Please model this.
Amino acid sequence: RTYSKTYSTPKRPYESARDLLTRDEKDPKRLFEGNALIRRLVRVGVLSEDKKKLDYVLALKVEDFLERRLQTQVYKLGLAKSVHHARVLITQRHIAVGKQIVNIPSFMVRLDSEKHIDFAPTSP
Amino acid sequence: RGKILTGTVVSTKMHRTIVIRRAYLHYIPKYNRYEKRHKNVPVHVSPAFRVQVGDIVTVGQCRPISKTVRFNVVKVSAAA
Amino acid sequence: NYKKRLLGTAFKSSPFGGSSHAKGIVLEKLGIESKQPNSAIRKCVRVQLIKNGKKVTAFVPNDGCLNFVDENDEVLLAGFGRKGKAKGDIPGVRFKVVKVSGVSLLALWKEKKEKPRS
RNA sequence: UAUCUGGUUGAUCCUGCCAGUAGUCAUAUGCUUGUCUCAAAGUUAAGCCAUGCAUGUCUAAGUAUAAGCAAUUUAUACAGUGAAACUGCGAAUGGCUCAUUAAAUCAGUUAUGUUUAUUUGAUAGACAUGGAUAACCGUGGUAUUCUAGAGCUAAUACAUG
RNA sequence: AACUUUUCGAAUCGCAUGGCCUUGUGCUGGCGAUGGUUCAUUCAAAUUUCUGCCCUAUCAACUUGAUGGUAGGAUAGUGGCCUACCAUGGUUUCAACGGGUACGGGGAAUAAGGGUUCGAUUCCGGAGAGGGAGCCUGAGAAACGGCUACCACAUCCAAGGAAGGCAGCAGGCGCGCAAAUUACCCAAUCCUAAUUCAGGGAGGUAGUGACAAUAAAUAACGAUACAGGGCCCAUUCGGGUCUUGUAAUUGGAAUGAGUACAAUGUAAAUACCUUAACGAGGAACAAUUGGAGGCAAGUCUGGUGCCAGCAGCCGCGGUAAUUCCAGCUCCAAUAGCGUAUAUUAAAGUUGUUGCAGUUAAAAAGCUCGUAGUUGACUUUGGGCCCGGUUGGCCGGUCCG
RNA sequence: CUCGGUACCUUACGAGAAAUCAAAGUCGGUUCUGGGGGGAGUAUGGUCGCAAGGCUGAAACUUAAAGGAAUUGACGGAAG
RNA sequence: GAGAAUUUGGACAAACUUGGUCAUUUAGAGGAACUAAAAGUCGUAACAAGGUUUCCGUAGGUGAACCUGCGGAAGGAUCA
RNA sequence: GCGGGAGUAACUAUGACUCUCUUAAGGUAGCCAAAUGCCUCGUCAUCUAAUUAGUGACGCGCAUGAAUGGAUUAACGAGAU
Model:
C-alpha cells in the first residue's frame, strides 16, 4: 500500500519530483479517509478507466470512491473500530446497509445512507 | 454487377464468341495514384457475328452458354 | 507497393528460434583476459547449443572463481548483451550464464556469501 | 490529441546513432512461496508409437418358438399367445491437425445450368403370385484367420406376372 | 412485359378397436403409421462471373489439349469435363512465367489517431488421415477407427502364414527454454435411433502449477501510565493538539480452515453450502525480492587491494572505494520481485496523416526525348469515373 | 527611360542551429538522391571493353561515435 | 439367363529406376583478405608555411610510409 | 652482372631492425619443390578391399626472377595422365 510495517505506513510518506506528486494526492486524502491500493487505483483510471472517461474534478472523484467503500467510512461512524476490521465486517456480511446484507465484499456503496448491523450479530 | 462497362475486342476469328479487354480506374491504397487493369473476359456475340477487332460493345449478364461465357454483347457501337 | 528497403531490427545473437534461454553441453572452461581499460582474468565457457548448434562464448559471473561449469556441463545460457550492447571490457561475450538450471542442474550457484540470493 | 532524459565536447547549439524510462506475452529461468474465483496450459520432429478406451442403437420393420419339435437360460397371480439370436438404420455426423495451398483457394458483392437419405403439404393406387435363405441340427477341415458338404424355415431380403 | 427463391423418372405392409353383412373364413368400417408414384416446401451441398491479393526483376520471356470454335463422347448439371478436325491465337512490365515464403477472414496486441506488427484460445470456410495407387458400397465417401494389390518399418507365428497404423482422449520414447491424470459421469445442454430408454474420452466437471487478472491484499483498534525534541497560545503557572520508543498493560474483537451436531439442494463420483450456540486449535496460515555514482527516490563506516568481483549504457576495483564485499544506515513497490524472450510505443528514424539535400549523409557531368504522371481556357446537358450521406447485421439503451 | 542577359556589389522585411542567403526566403507540377562511423564503392554475379578498368552493388563482423557551425590560447624557418 | 475365374484389346491417374541440367547445405586439400591485441622493426608520410602546402582522381616506378607527371578544388585568408 | 659474419622483440618460438667486415656495387613486379631438389615413403586433406596418381596443400627454395623476356589468354591436332 506504500509501505512497511503497521505504524510506519502513513509516516514514511508524510501525514495521517515524481514521488512527491503521487504522495500529494495520497496523504491529505488519507487524512479524511485512507484505503488506497496500487493495482486497484490503475482501474479507477490513473492509467485506465473512469478518470480518463470523465473530465470532472479528478481529485474529488478519488474522494468519492473511498467514502462509497463501506470499509473506510464505518471508521467515521465508530461502530467497527478499525479500517481493516471493517475489512472483515463487510466480508462476513455483518454491516447491513438498507438494511440489506452485502453481496460482494468489494461493495461500492455510499456514505449518506444509514449504517447498522444486521439483527443477530448486533453488538458483540 | 449491373451497370454497362467498357470492353474493346482483342481476339476475333471464330464463330459466336470473342475475347474483350476491360479497363477500370482504381486507386492503389498507399499511392493514391490511379491504375488500370487487364482482364481476359470471353463474351458471346450472336450467331450472326457482327463484331470486328476494336469495337466498343455493351456488356451485360445473360445465359452461361459456356461456363466462363456468362456475358453477352447486344449493341455494337463502334466499328474498329 | 512502395517503400525503400527497410531491414527489421536484429539482435546480434547467433542462436535464434523463439526461445528465451538454451541448453548447451559445453567444450571447455576458459579464463580469458580483456581489452585496454581494465585488467583481471574474467571467466568464460565455450557453450555449444543442442537445438541451434552454434558456438558461442558466454561470461560466467559467480562468487566462485573456479566455480563448477566443467568441460561437459549442461549449462543454461541467457541474454545480457542480447539485451543492450555487448560488454566493453571483454568483448565477444554477449551471453551470460544462469545458475542451477536446465534439466540436469549441473552448474552451481554463488557460494561463500550469505546476502540474499540472485 | 502526442511533455523526454543520459552518453560524441574545454564549453555551446545543431545534426545523428545508441542506451533507458511505458504497456504487453499460451510464456521461460533464478529466488521466495500463504490462500481463492475465473481463464489458459507441445510453440521443438505432419517424428515413431505400447496398452485401455473414443461407434452404436431399435424388437415399436417381421416370422412371432401356440397347434408340432432337441438342449440350455430367465421371469410369474395364472396364462406365460414371451425376450436376450439371425436380419435392417449410423459409421460422410462429431472430434483432431495446418503438411499443403499466392491458389477459380479465401475474403466483398453476386449469378445459373443442377442434386437433395431424412423432414413437411396434397390426390389416386396399394392387387394377385412364385422361388430361395441364414439362425438352427447332426458331422467334417485348420495354428489362427477363414470356413466345407447336407437338411428344415420367415420377411418391408429377392424375383416374376 | 416487375422481381427473387424453390422445384423430376417403375408399389410393402404391419398395429389397436369393433356393429351389421359377406366369406374360398385372409373382407368391410374407423383410426394411427409406413412404403412406390405425382407435384410442392424446408434445410444442406455443388457450379460460376466480376473485383481486390506477399516479397523477389541480382527471376524476362512464357504458353499446343494452349486460347476458342466445330461436332460427337461423358456428366446430376454448366463446361475442352474429353477427343478428332480446323484457325493461329492467348498471357506479360497495369509484372506473365519461375524461385523463395505462407492456410484466409471475423479478430488479437500496441498507439492520441494515422499506422505498424501478428492470425494462439473462440467462430466461420478450405485442405489432410504411415507412403504412393485404385475401386466398391451409398442419397452423401474415391472414406481416420471401410476394402484390395504394392513398398518400407516394428510385432506375432506351429515357418505353412497372418495381424497392424494415436495429425481422437489419457499416456510412452525422443526432441526441448518449456507445458498438466493411463481421473469421474449421463444428471444438465446438444447429437444419433415412434416412446420408454440406451450410447457419447462430445460435453459437463475434478485434479495439477503464483500462469495471469481480481478481491481480501504484505495486519489495525478504544483506554491508561512515562520520557525527549518542535510550534501556537500564555493569566508564565501551565494547557492544548499531536507520535521513532516503552509496559507480565487492560478490554478484547476478528477472518481463512478443521471437527462434532442440526438444517438444505443436484448426484453415478471426489471434495458439501449456510446460520446460530458451545468447546478446542491455529492465527490475519512463517515475507521476501530489488535498488542506493549520473540517467533513477536513496550515505556513511569497516574489510579487500586490477585480486576476489559487479557491469544496460558511460564505467568502477592496483590503500582512506557513497559503484566490489559485509554491516548498520536509507528509498520504492509488494505476494510478487528481478532477469531473459519478442512485438509495439519512445521514432516526424521509411513521413499516407507528418521528414531532409550551400557547409553535417544527400541534385544524376550536361543536353534530348518515349512510355508514364500532371494540365491555360469560354457555354452546356448526357455519358464515364472518384468521393460521400442515408437504410439492411451486431452491441448498448428502451419494454417485461 | 524601357526591355533581356544579369561578373556582381550592398541591404530592410522575413527565415535558420548559426556563419550567411536575398532565395539556399518561399511555392506548386515532375524527376533524381540521403537514413551512424569502419568494413565499402570492396566482395560476388550480370553487363560493357582490345586491355588497363567502368557500370550495377552487399553481408558477416567490429565500435560508441564519426561529423557540421562558432570560441579561447600557445606556436610559426608569419607580417607590422 | 446370372455369378466367379481366366485370356486379349483400349484409354486414364501416379509411383519406381536410369541419364542430363540448375539451385541450396555440409565436409574439405588449398588460397587470399580483415578485425582486435601489449611489446618490436624501418622511415618521418600527415600535423605550424612540419621547413618541397595538402587531398582526391589517374598513369609509371621503388624495401617502405612513398616519389614523380597531368588536371582541379579551399577541404589555405578574401568571391582568387 | 645482381654478398658474408655477428647481435637482437613478454612466452614456447621467431627476427623486425641494427652493427660489422668485404667488393665495382648487392635485385623489383609476380611465381615455386620443376625437362633443374642432395635432403624425402617430407608434411597435410580427400580418395582406394591397399592408393604416393586422381587432388589438397605444406614451407624444410642442395641452386626462381622481366627483352635471344615476365604476363593477359580464345580457337585448332595420326601428340601426354
